Enzyme design. Sequence first.
Site, short mmCIF file in Angstrom:
data_model
loop_
_atom_site.label_atom_id
_atom_site.label_comp_id
_atom_site.label_asym_id
_atom_site.label_seq_id
_atom_site.Cartn_x
_atom_site.Cartn_y
_atom_site.Cartn_z
N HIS A 146 0.79 -1.25 0.06
CA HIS A 146 0.02 0.08 -0.06
C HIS A 146 0.57 1.26 -0.09
O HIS A 146 0.27 2.28 -0.06
CB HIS A 146 -1.01 0.15 1.36
N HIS A 183 2.58 7.08 1.22
CA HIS A 183 1.98 6.20 1.79
C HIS A 183 0.44 6.41 1.37
O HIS A 183 -0.01 7.36 1.79
CB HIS A 183 2.15 6.21 3.13
#
Lengths: 150, 150, 370, 370, 492, 286
Positions: free
Chosen positions: A57, A72
């Site tokens: 992710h 992120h």
Amino acid sequence: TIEIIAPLSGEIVNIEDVPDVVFAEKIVGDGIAIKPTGNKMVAPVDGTIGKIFETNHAFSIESDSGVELFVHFGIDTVELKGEGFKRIAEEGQRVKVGDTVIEFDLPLLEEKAKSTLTPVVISNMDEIKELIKLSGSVTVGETPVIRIKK
Amino acid sequence: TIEIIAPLSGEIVNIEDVPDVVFAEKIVGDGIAIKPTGNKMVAPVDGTIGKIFETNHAFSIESDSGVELFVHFGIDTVELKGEGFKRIAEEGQRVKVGDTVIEFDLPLLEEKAKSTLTPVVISNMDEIKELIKLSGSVTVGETPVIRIKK
Amino acid sequence: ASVQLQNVTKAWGEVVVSKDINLDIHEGEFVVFVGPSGCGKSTLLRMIAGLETITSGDLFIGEKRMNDTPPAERGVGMVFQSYALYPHLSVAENMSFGLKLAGAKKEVINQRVNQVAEVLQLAHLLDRKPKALSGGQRQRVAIGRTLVAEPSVFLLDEPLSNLDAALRVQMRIEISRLHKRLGRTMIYVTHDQVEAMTLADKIVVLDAGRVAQVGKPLELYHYPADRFVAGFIGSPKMNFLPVKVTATAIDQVQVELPMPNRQQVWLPVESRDVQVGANMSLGIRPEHLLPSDIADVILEGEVQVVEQLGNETQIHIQIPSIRQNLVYRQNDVVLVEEGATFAIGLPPERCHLFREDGTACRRLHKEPGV
Amino acid sequence: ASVQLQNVTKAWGEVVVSKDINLDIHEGEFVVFVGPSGCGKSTLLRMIAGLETITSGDLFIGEKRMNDTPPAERGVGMVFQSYALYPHLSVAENMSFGLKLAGAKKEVINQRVNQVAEVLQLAHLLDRKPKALSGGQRQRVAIGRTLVAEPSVFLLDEPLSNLDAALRVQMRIEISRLHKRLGRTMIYVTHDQVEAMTLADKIVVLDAGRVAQVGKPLELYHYPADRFVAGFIGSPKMNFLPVKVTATAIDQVQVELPMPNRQQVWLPVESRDVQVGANMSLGIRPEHLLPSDIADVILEGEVQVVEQLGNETQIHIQIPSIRQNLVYRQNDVVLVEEGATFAIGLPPERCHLFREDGTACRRLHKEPGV
Amino acid sequence: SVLGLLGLLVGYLVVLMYAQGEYLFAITTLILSSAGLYIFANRKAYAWRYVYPGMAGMGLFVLFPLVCTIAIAFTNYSSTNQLTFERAQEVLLDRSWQAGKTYNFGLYPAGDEWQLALSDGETGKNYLSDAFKFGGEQKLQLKETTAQPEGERANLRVITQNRQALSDITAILPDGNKVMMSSLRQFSGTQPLYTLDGDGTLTNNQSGVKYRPNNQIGFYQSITADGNWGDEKLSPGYTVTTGWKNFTRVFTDEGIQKPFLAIFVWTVVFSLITVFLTVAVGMVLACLVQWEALRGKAVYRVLLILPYAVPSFISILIFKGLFNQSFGEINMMLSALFGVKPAWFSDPTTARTMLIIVNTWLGYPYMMILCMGLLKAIPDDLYEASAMDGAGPFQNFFKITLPLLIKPLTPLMIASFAFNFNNFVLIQLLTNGGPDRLGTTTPAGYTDLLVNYTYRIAFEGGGGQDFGLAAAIATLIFLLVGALAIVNLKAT
Amino acid sequence: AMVQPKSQKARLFITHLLLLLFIAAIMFPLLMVVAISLRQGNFATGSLIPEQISWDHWKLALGFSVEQADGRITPPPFPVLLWLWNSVKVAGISAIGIVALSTTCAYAFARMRFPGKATLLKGMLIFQMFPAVLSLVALYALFDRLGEYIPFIGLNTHGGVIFAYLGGIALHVWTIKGYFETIDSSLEEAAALDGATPWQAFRLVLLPLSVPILAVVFILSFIAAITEVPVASLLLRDVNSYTLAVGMQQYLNPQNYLWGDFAAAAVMSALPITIVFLLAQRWLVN
């Protein structure tokens, strides 16, 4: 003077508005967050990709100039255990601006992850003397967002 | 085991209830405060009187055993500039329990000074290993108040 | 003793620590510098004293240029963080070290020392060594030093940083009583935002050297200059909402929440020179949040963590729509279990609005006191 | 992981730092030790870890004597105030230093380290030296270290003491998030009273080693054990009033104010073990003081100093009759000039009563939350 | 304002330094001092007033002899050439043949010393010298007195018992005539054997040969109205300037490069072995001394410090008497239980073993004191946190203590290396060279360091003292052991 | 007091034994010196432990002309008290000089700002690495030419040795410099506000505070001056002008092998210095 290009398309939002004490108070680093509308996280600058999370992710990347970035997606998205994400790039791989690193499914993540907002910050702030944040809407791997000064 | 005799007559009140942050939080020292009803400040223990204020509202005294005490009448009594007090003893003088050091007129000080409460604390707390505080009403130069142990 | 700065700049070669700053400090005004660890506040006070050199600008201590003037002849005292007590001298000597040298008066020294030692309760410890004193007592010696010299301006560089927790809070009152009784200019410095609000008449919030805002403590609380001051001042952090401008009006800005249920709300704030479509920020203090029943902008949510402080009760609320954790603060006590649904209202009257750069739109809602 | 102490004593020869104390901590309970700088809280945590020896008594960590048991085989992790990071190892090595020695598994190590760095956002700085990290980052590595080992009990020795002012407050929520997510015993330690109230399920207030009181956070605020705890807890310090007892009853004590007017008032409090004529202490919190119009026990006075915090308003009042400085705290904002006459009421229901020795009479007035 | 006062000496003495030779020292008397006047002058450089008196000692007693040693490297200062040319001629001017003028003498002792009193028969004026003690040769200046000297003259036996020291007296009269003892009752004036004219040409007054100063070898040489070289030369030589002949003699072959390259490898190894052992012994002890789990930390400490404590000269010399081959108490015990008598002085290998043992004995406690204080820099939390994870005492010293200590110890490591490289106090005192190296023109040894080899060449007891070469090879070691400071500071 | 695993006694016991054997090994040479004093005669051949207690060394190396029955009245082979006193003359004066230079100079390196400080300290450390033993050749010639001009500081003189030691102060400066930094940095700036110049501050504030470290450096230099051998032996020549460090070399002579009397002089060197060197090393607590 090195200019950092946005990893994904959307709108530039202030980092302090991020719903997480780690990102908001600028502990991990300083930068900005973008409201995701695209479907791909592009490497922001030309350099070597440091590491990619097991959840796929997020990832880290260090420029050739000597600037350690960190992209992120979302906040506390780890709980999804890589459900909706798909890994394209590899740890260590050398990339350039406009290169696809991680592809994601927006409609699924919009109603699953705790947050969609995607912070983009620099780890090694000590090297950077001055940092400036841009505003307005952005596109995938084209429109600049941050202009640092080593 | 050393026994400290009250400098003036009245009632023993907790030191933390004194209307002054300097005495209450125990910065000057630890001990007790007495509500003045008498009209003379007597030397608490046998020893040499350390120092006496110019306003003559308070004085210090060190026992022969080796305990430096400190008796201070009222709170912010310095502002009165020595109006109501009268010095009897002298700086350096050697005294014993029951000896008059300073005589004062209470009602005048009661209707001028911010407070009458008289803290009695010890300067050298490092020397004292154990300390216990007494309660109840006390008389002039007779009833004990503090029992320390060097 | 009216000190004032005019475009004062400082730099260590290439590093520019302090951009051109302007400060107007009147006679008998209590000014306090505040900011994060290392942001000009430390250096600024030293530049006024003369301990640090000035790169550019001017320094006027009582309407006179003091840039080239040496520290001693400026007529200003200072108390350091380390208190700067002389170990090989007594307390009386430490306070009277200024008068003892360069024109000495034995009769005046003993008089000046006693007057100060009486009110600070240090007369019994005149013939003592600084190492024999406690942490709290040593501070009183430092303050006593300056009171002897009787300077035009007092410079306090974070004195309440060596004391204990409860002791620090209680000693803040001594400074207030110390100020009005003496009645003279004092430049206090601290890192805790509460210390300034309770003490200062005029607070100067610094950010990376740049002056963020200058004004009364209540003015900074209600009418911040940017996202920095609004986020910096207050016991809990202000709630930030990444809104978006939809339409403007004569004297109010309508914004859209970044939530999927994109609700609209009219904020009574300066609507001049504001672009539509621009993603700005909405600020709201937890103490200003109203229960859902009253307001029109309803927000439902789940309670994650409850904090019972006794005098007040703070509750963290997770909103289903906006992916953001909102914090709510109500007085007295409120028994709510973790996981129960809890809704709150969003009052537009008590809202702040910040642009992308950080600058805040001036609030139009009139508050009493400002 | 239910740790419990039974008459544990510690002494450095003759100096008894900690009298026989008893503590009952159940599994998955968040306990916080609190007290002034150096009063057992520092030493107590180390005795549980095994870093300090126990003079007498017994220690049962999960129903087993651990007094003679070495620290390693106790199955417990710890984070120090200085974080205890190794300068000559990387971040990944510092977190994995526990597993690397005494039975090493290189492939497993790399997995566990990543899993913890994943949730703590430390994956990007794994190959870094502790001196290259910020103050906030260095703490996460320390916390991360224990999380890798995955011990039975967590021991936090003042972790939020190296951070900035605003950073400490904001990171305080994270500790709460760390607890409920893992769900395991944690023994937190702090000197700030606010830090305990927001976190703990069970607070342990220490005074010179001796346990003052143990219980829920609301209990310490509403029903203190002695003058120490009552004065320690709360944003402002509680007002102590040197009253004198006139008469007692079945379940109420009449007290006389030390004022020249000497008014008498019936306080609804436990009248067990109280002698008449004894000079005791009346306690009343600033937030609980009512405006003059409501209550019957009126106290007139002059306003000395006003404190404007925006969210609240603190006012210091000097009472002409009782020689004591009263502190009053009202919410919202209250515009009052310094020197104006301001009267307030004293509700007996919200009053505490402390004897000479210090012990407090248990309040009978039922408060919500307890 | 006071510069005019100080400006007097700096210039008055400098020119006086410039005069009467002394060109080597006249420079520093100006350079170091003039900078001092500039510093104490203006208030623009306030900080330099403090560091100047410190630099004065450094620049005069450390920097100056260092620069001076480099200067002598080019010069030819030797045993044959000790003085300058201007000092090598008046000594020749005093060498003389006998021109028997009669001068009767009487030896009268004054106080606790002697005093010569001549008596002239021709002029009539008596001559008296001053108080001197019998021993060696010396020139006594006589003064003029008409009165007869006090006391009685020493008989024939007294002067005969001291006929050696009395004969060596070369007294000088107020008028200029040299006078030496001719008989037991007579002294006799002489005319010099050499005379100097306009040019620096010396001519003999007996053999009638002329000499001229030859500045190629630093001696007086004679020629026969042709050429510049030849014939016999006199060896009261003088210090003369030379080229780089001192350096090339060591580089280009010769029986001097042979030991030089050999002792250099020994010098390098000796220091390396000393540092390696002392640090290892020092660090291990240091951790043990302040180890929490102990009993007599205070007592254990002071005993271990004793070798560094007790001064070098005494600590070393006792080992000298202990390590004797035939005598000494150590070889006595080594012959008791074991049947071996190691040659600590004769055997090359066995000797080197002794030097390392004695130096490590001296070197270990200094490394202890250094490491003990340096170990305190490490916070206890590291050892506490390690114990929490189950780390043994050995695992701590290897994974926590050592790799953390090597960083600040690195510059302190090579610091001891440089000092042991020039450990002249040990070598020239214990073995005084040790096993003597055979087949060398210069005095050398198997256990001699570079610092010793330089000293031996310049100060050997009758082994061809070459101050020029010694200072020249001392210039080589200056670049060797001195320029290692570049890694001591820049790298660390 | 951390709880200790593996009973601790096992690991501790071997440590006690190893240290006890090590201290015995290193004190062994020191014990022999004590033993020789007791022993009779300078001979090595015999039983190693002293056969007969003799005070010969204790008297001869002190300053006595005592004797036996066979060998007649022998004077002290060497004047030791003459040497011991001379070292005090040399060290006592040299220590003051080193202190005098190091005192003011160290103050600038720690509590002051100037551009030279960077390149200055770099030089001080380097020049100290080169010892004063590598220039013994030049020192002889230095004091030779300087001797004829100024007699009392030339060859074979006390002052000649005194001026020699004033050079090596760089390490002694660093020690005092280290102590100056221990004191609070605000000390200098505080006195400046009261109206005191850097010198006026230095003289009345930091100097009396830095007295303990001066006495340490003074004594450390005092002891260090006593042990100085190469420069001292080089400079000196007269027999009645030797220092304690130079004279002890005469005892261990190839021909006149006087090993017996070496022990008393070894105690006259150690004992006065032994009480002093250990206390000077425990004097610092700053």
